[PDB]
Design a protein around this ligand. Structure first.
Ligand SMILES: *C(=O)[C@@H](NC(=O)Cc1ccccc1)[C@@H]1N[C@@H](C(=O)O)C(C)(C)S1
Length: 641
């Protein structure tokens, strides 16, 4: 019993070395090679575990129900149950048996082939057959493909079928101008270290009709992931890349020959899309004939994922951004169906997944406008659009009377001289008697600032805490919860007023904005947005009063219909619109000289069919989200009542 304690420790140390992948330490715990002792030397045990466990990608060896007895002055037997993870799943309920050896002072293990796998005897071999699973598709709300696997034609050249130095240099220029490729880059491709004369060096993937093939140009059909919308949904969908050896070490169920989602929904739904590897893990005898099947199951393809996205709305929303920095979110506000999640500028997902040069990839990362950012999931200051919420809160707690006129003379105002040089600014001084309808049409920041200070921080945060601030939305998109300020108290009348017109320490991403503003399409009920089609419509009752909704929405119509409304350019559509524009100022967020973001909110006040929140980040002069909304508003109005 004094030595049985060391035997149970030796078996525990041996399993840990196998689990940790250090087969040399596990082999050094075995006795000398002899009959009725260890069956192989330390190096022979190392090369057998490295072969068998390495082939099946064994990871996470865990044991239980250990028992170590005695049988002689040196023969102590042990037994335990174990489970392990392989390329074909978990191998559980394994019965292991063996004997330890207590000689001299230390206790070792009489190694046997049955300690690799239970029923292995002598010179038995192990074989592994696998069949890769087909990756599932990502489809929109009407079944249109957003991410699928198809047969893409690949362009490539064979250096031997080119020329001889003089005739070769002519076809390189001929094959470069007929496919829009840099002639200096084609020579770069056939100059890689892996290239041989009679090899097919791939160049690009033709996404259309195949032109004329010069001397040495060949087209080979290959299978790969394809994104029909390309840039228009690259941030949302993402891309898949080659699976590396480090990916297999973290999850051996992955197919070494397959693709893995690197970003977007391809990565978020990688498990459901990649399926399960089929095949058989069996123990053969010395000749190679099967004698024991450890694991076997049929290949299961990946499940399709159906989104609430409208492909025609996703493409239109992205194209309307004209390559500028910004994003657009379109929802059906009564249910929360995310119709479009566009972010601009964007990258080419087909280029990323079908091989891309380190220059084009560095161009994406060195781009100042940062196309890799999912801007619909990035928090921004809401802008003057937030005045809708501030007004609704003031109407609910009785601070704001819709017909009461505040006297606002000039273009600047401050509470007292304690504000120093800071003054809430105004765009027009033509209306000195300002009511709620006037303040929403002209976007009067002074009105919102005075009513917020009159409301007070306590009453303002009471209505704000009824929204989704600090909540993690149940969406497969990585985002941080919205915030009112950095701390739980403004501790500043200036910050309280700035938050009043949506320009304080507020941080709300476009998706969360569409969630908050949905109260104006559901009589004060907040409807959470959903991206997966089969999910249930979750809402939140009594966020703002229905009395406030029936007061603000008529004024939001006037933001479009009134001749001095900030969204009057949208009245050309001739459709029922309720809108609220916004322009936020960001001063040296990193460091600059003054950048401003443009915002637009709009929805149908008659049928509540659609809702839209578009924005431009670091906008150019005379550019805005309202300028670019006619096309998307037209489509959403006709197709979503
Ligand atoms: C809300 O966002 C308000 N914006 C400002 O006070 C900042 C600003 C930025 C550029 C020029 C002037 C003022 C108001 N809303 C916007 C808008 O709705 O477009 C206005 C420009 C009307 S000021």
């Amino acid at each position: 019993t004094q030595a049985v304690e060391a035997g149970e420790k030796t078996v525990e140390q041996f399993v840990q070395a196998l689990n940790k992948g250090d087969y040399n330490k596990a082999a050094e715990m075995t006795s000398k090679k002899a009959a009725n002792k260890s069956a192989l030397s330390e190096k022979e045990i190392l090369d057998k575990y490295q072969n068998i466990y390495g082939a099946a990608d064994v990871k996470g060896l865990q044991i239980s129900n250990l028992k170590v007895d005695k049988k002689d002055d040196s023969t102590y037997s042990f037994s335990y149950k174990a489970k392990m993870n392989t390329s074909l799943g978990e191998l559980k309920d394994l019965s292991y048996k063996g004997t330890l050896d207590r000689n001299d002072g230390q206790t070792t293990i009489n190694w046997q082939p049955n300690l690799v796998f239970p029923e292995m005897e002598g010179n038995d071999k192990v074989s592994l057959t696998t069949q890769e699973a087909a990756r599932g598709n990502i489809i929109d709300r009407n079944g249109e493909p957003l991410a699928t696997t198809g047969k893409l034609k690949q362009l490539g050249v064979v250096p031997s079928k080119l020329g001889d130095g003089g005739e070769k240099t002519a076809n390189i220029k001929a094959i470069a101008s007929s496919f829009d490729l840099t002639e200096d880059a084609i020579n770069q491709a056939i100059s890689q270290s892996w290239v041989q004369p009679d090899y097919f060096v791939p160049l690009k993937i033709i996404d259309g009709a195949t032109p004329e093939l010069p001397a040495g140009a060949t087209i080979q059909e290959v299978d790969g992931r394809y994104y029909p919308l390309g840039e228009a949904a690259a941030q949302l969908i993402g891309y898949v890349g080659d699976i590396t050896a480090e990916d297999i070490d973290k999850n051996p169920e992955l197919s070494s020959n397959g693709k893995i989602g690197r970003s977007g929904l391809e990565m978020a739904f990688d498990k459901d899309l990649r399926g399960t590897t089929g095949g058989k893990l069996s123990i053969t005898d010395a000749d190679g004939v099967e004698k024991k099947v450890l694991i076997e199951h049929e290949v299961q393809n990946g499940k399709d994922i159906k989104l609430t996205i409208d492909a025609k709305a996703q493409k239109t929303a992205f194209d309307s951004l004209g390559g500028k920095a910004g994003s657009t979110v379109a929802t059906t506000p009564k249910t929360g169906d995310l119709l479009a999640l566009a972010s601009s500028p964007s990258y080419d997902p087909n280029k990323m997944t079908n091989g891309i040069s380190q220059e084009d990839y560095k161009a994406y990362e060195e781009n100042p406008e940062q196309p890799f950012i999912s801007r619909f999931a990035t928090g921004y200051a809401p802008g003057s659009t937030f005045k809708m919420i501030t007004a609704a809160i003031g109407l609910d707690n009785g601070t704001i009377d819709p017909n009461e006129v505040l006297t606002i003379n000039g273009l600047k105002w401050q509470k007292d001289s304690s504000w120093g040089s800071y003054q809430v600014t105004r765009v027009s001084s033509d209306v000195s008697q300002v009511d709620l309808k006037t303040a929403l049409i002209y976007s009067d920041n002074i009105y919102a600032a005075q009513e917020t200070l009159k409301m007070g921080e306590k009453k303002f945060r009471t209505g704000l805490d009824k929204f989704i601030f600090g909540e993690d939305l149940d969406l497969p998109i990585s985002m941080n919860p919205a915030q009112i300020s950095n701390e739980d108290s403004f501790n500043s009348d200036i910050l309280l007023a700035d938050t009043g017109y949506g320009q304080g320490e507020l941080l709300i991403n476009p998706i969360q904005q569409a969630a908050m503003y949905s109260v104006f399409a559901n009589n004060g009920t907040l409807v959470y947005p959903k991206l997966i089609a089969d999910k249930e419509t979750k809402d939140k009752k009594n966020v703002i009063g229905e009395t406030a909704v029936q007061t603000i929405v008529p004024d939001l119509r006037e933001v479009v219909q009134d001749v001095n409304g900030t969204a009057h350019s949208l009245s050309a559509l001739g459709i029922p619109l309720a809108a609220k524009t916004g322009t936020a100022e960001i001063k040296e967020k990193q460091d600059v000289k003054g950048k401003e973001n443009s915002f637009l909110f709009a929805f149908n006040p008659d049928n509540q069919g659609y809702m839209m929140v578009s924005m431009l980040e670091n906008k150019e002069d005379d550019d805005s989200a309202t300028k670019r909304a006619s096309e998307l508003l037209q489509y959403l109005n006709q197709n979503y009542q």
